[PDB]
């Protein structure tokens, strides 16, 4: 009988939160940004095409120098590209070919990856032997690894399909903090610019804000109607955007603790795989199942442009730290680099 | 810029070494055919093929038929929700689906599993090799008469054996009447969608059946050949 009692108290708390969010919803982001001029039409050309992967690409991550990037393919190889020259700097053969995520360390000395093997493998790029070797295998997750992001050379946060996120100490190989509370598979995570907080999106159609040091969920964001596949912090750290299978993108605010804007179109009926922001945050780039990448106006919810250069699913995309270019990865095994021209 | 000039040459020379290794790996990657093994726990999917390795939480089975390498993957260490990691196998040659024919209670669940996998948006172009395992148990259950299939499937009351059926010699007509009924349940889902992009290959197999490796080879040969006719129309 106590379970029924707690079920009703939860509804009262949910109504209290919903009323609190409605109380501070005095205006709409659309009304605030109505006066500003639109960004116009955004035209981007494919400057580079990265060829070499034999299987569908599942993840990519830029290095902090805005020149090197690492891309993970499903054939079992990790390749590091020099985007300026399209030269391959490294090719790391993976023990398990079913990799789903990859991360580039901010120092540039390490890369991470992992997939259906439930392991986050750390690879040392700067060895005296001249070859890339596995330095750490982070075991402990009971589901597939969906996303991973370095905090520094010694700390990394991983999200798994066992509904939990973990913070790992690479030197000791143990997970210092475990982030629990999602009821579905966590598909993505994004780090705040100060690396004190991170948001994660799961298959329960909810986004949770986690405190890295404290290790608990600070805020929960709802609004999506299907599994969340992508998430990305706003450049100032006070907001984030998500992408779900319901063909919508939503902009949530941390301080207002509610959704601010929805980015959807009637023609779009396919799921969203990846999201990222431009350096100023004015543009939101989202990848879709229809082989296209739509550039949205974050403030005005206008489709600024379309990146149509892939013949299969766009699985990932990312914008460089300096904002100079955007790379898009796809299931057709190719990577493309995009930027505009004057 | 003389110092910088040779730096690009060194990076370009390292690129060629990587490209040479990628070509060697490309030959091995395309010479191996990857299969996804599916089925419930009661199904004997782990013993379908008579080199077995366990890599992380994935059970890898590698066998060679007529100098062709097949790499069959079984996913064990995952939760019951599989609508996300099933997309990792969207480029496999075929899906191996194993069903316990004698298990009438869980037979409807196997149909629902087949229906979702068949109609998955990322699996619309992948053929399925269907193994209706444990036929000897099905024969005993029908002959005993303790359990009636019509109790679980009302359509069995007014079902007739197909004219194209090829029952084994010395087989009870009741057994082959019900043996082909379960097969048509999976073929009804198969033939109601797909639009020709993929087909289903039903087989009758038992626990002591060493020909299942050959059957996969023959079916994947027809899958690849049908794939070639579609994507190599313009040579």
């Amino acid at each position, epitope marked *: 009988s106590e379970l029924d009692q707690l079920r009703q108290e939860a509804e009262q708390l949910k109504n209290q939160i919903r009323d609190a969010r409605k109380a501070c919803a005095d205006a709409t982001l659309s009304q605030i940004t109505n006066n500003i001029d639109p960004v116009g039409r955004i035209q981007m050309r494919t400057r580079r095409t990265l060829r070499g992967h034999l299987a569908k690409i599942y993840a990519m991550h830029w290095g902090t120098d805005s020149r090197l990037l690492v891309s993970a393919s499903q054939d079992g190889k990790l390749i590091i590209w020099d985007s300026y020259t399209t030269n391959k700097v490294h090719a790391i053969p993976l023990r398990s070919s079913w990799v789903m995520t990859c991360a580039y360390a901010p120092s540039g000395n390490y890369v991470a990856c992992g997939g259906l093997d439930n392991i986050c493998s750390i690879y040392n790029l700067k060895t005296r032997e001249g070859n890339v070797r596995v330095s750490r295998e982070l075991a402990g997750h009971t589901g597939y690894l969906s996303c991973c992001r370095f905090l520094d050379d010694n700390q990394i946060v991983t999200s798994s399909g066992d509904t939990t996120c973990a913070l790992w100490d690479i030197e000791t190989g143990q997970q210092t903090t475990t982030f629990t509370g999602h009821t579905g598979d966590v598909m993505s995570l994004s780090l705040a610019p100060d690396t004190r907080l991170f948001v994660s999106g799961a298959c329960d159609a909810s986004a949770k804000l986690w405190d890295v040091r404290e290790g608990m969920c600070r805020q929960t964001f*709802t609004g999506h109607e299907s599994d969340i596949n992508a998430i990305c912090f706003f450049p100032n750290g006070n907001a984030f955007a998500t992408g779900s299978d319901d063909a919508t993108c939503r902009l949530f605010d941390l301080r207002a603790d509610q959704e601010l804007m929805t980015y959807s179109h009637d023609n779009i009926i396919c799921g969203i795989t990846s999201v990222s922001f431009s350096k100023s945050g004015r543009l939101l780039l989202a990848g879709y199942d229809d082989f296209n990448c739509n550039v949205w106006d974050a403030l005005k919810a206008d489709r600024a442009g379309v990146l149509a250069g892939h013949d299969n699913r766009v699985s990932c995309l990312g914008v460089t730290d300096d904002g100079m270019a955007v790379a898009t990865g796809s299931w057709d095994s190719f990577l493309k680099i995009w930027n505009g021209s004057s | 810029t003389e110092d910088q000039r040779n730096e690009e040459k060194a990076q370009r020379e390292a690129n060629k070494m990587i490209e040479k290794q990628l070509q060697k790996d490309k030959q091995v990657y395309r010479a191996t055919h990857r299969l996804l093994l599916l089925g419930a726990d009661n199904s004997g999917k782990s013993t379908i093929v008579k080199i077995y390795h366990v890599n992380s939480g994935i059970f890898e089975t590698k066998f060679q038929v007529d100098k062709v390498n097949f790499h069959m993957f079984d996913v064990g260490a995952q939760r019951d*929700e*599989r609508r996300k990691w099933i997309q990792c196998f969207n480029d496999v040659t075929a899906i191996i689906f194993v069903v316990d024919s004698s298990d009438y209670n869980r037979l409807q669940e196997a149909l*629902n599993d087949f229906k979702s996998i068949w109609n998955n948006r990322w699996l619309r172009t992948i053929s399925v090799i269907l193994f209706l395992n444990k036929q000897d148990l099905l024969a005993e259950k029908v002959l005993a008469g303790k359990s009636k299939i019509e*109790d679980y499937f*009302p359509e069995f009351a007014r079902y007739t054996t197909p004219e194209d059926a090829t029952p084994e010699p010395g087989e009870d007509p009741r057994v082959t009447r019900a043996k082909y009924f379960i097969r048509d349940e999976f073929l009804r889902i198969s033939t109601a969608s797909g639009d020709g992009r993929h087909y289903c290959y039903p087989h009758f197999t038992c626990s002591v059946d060493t020909e299942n490796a050959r059957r996969i080879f023959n079916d994947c040969r027809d899958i690849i050949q049908r794939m070639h006719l579609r994507q190599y129309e313009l040579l």
Partner: nanobody
Amino acid sequence: QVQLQESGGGLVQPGGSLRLSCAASGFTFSNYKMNWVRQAPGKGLEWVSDISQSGASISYTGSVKGRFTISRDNAKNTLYLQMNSLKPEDTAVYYCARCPAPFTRDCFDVTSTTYAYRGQGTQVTVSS
């Protein structure tokens, strides 16, 4: 927030009739295929029936075929399950399950142990 509220049910004598109602909120009800899932005591969850987005396609489990009728009201955002000629083997907790993605023919994980888009469930008892 996606939420489903199952209403109806209770204690009914064998051979009686019972109607279940599922109230949908937090999503566009007309864009999703809906399912009915039950869990008998001592047994796992099993799929009972599903109805397509427009109601054109309808399926049932063979154990309940000819006795259960499933209908949906997109305008009312409500799902119904008419259960007549009930049997003591139908005593179970009935769940209203939504397919994970819109505009799809597949429905993968509705009959799973921990499914996010499934309601709390309603108790149906048929034993006299």
